[PDB]
Design a protein around this ligand. Structure first.
Ligand code: HEC
Length: 104
């Protein structure tokens, strides 16, 4: 994906509930720094639902592509409010941005 396009999607659709920078605060949702290669429910100090703590997948490009299409279908019982991104390319652009931003 295209990182600049991703950054725009992040600002518009995610930044209202999430930070990405190292040591960024938890907001409504967890700070996402270090997500890639991590199991569900491991942002330090955030209080997750049982649903997301116990989903038991590792985050990465493929699992984010599925989750972001429809979060509640992927993690029934999640408290994240987000319908989903239908378009494959927009999911790829957002994921490429996150892969950069959450590891910088
Ligand atoms: C925009 C498309 C995004 C992206 C990329 C993510 N979200 Fe959220 N998020 C919110 C809350 C309250 C949670 C906790 C859920 C729970 O405990 O049930 C989440 C969780 C996530 C994750 C999982 C993180 C993990 O460590 O397992 C991921 C990858 C994630 N989000 C990405 C809250 C919100 C919002 C509040 C209205 C909105 C909007 C979004 N999230 C949007 C996004």
């Amino acid at each position: 994906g295209d990182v600049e396009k991703g950054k725009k999607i992040f600002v518009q659709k995610c930044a209202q509930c999430h930070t990405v920078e190292k040591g960024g605060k938890h907001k409504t949702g967890p700070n996402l720094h270090g997500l890639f290669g991590r199991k569900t429910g491991q942002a330090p100090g955030f209080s997750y639902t049982d649903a997301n703590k116990n989903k038991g997948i590792t985050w990465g490009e493929e699992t984010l592509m599925e989750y972001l299409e429809n979060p509640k279908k992927y993690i029934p019982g999640t408290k994240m409010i987000f319908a989903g991104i239908k378009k494959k390319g927009e999911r790829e652009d957002l994921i490429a941005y996150l892969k950069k931003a959450t590891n910088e």
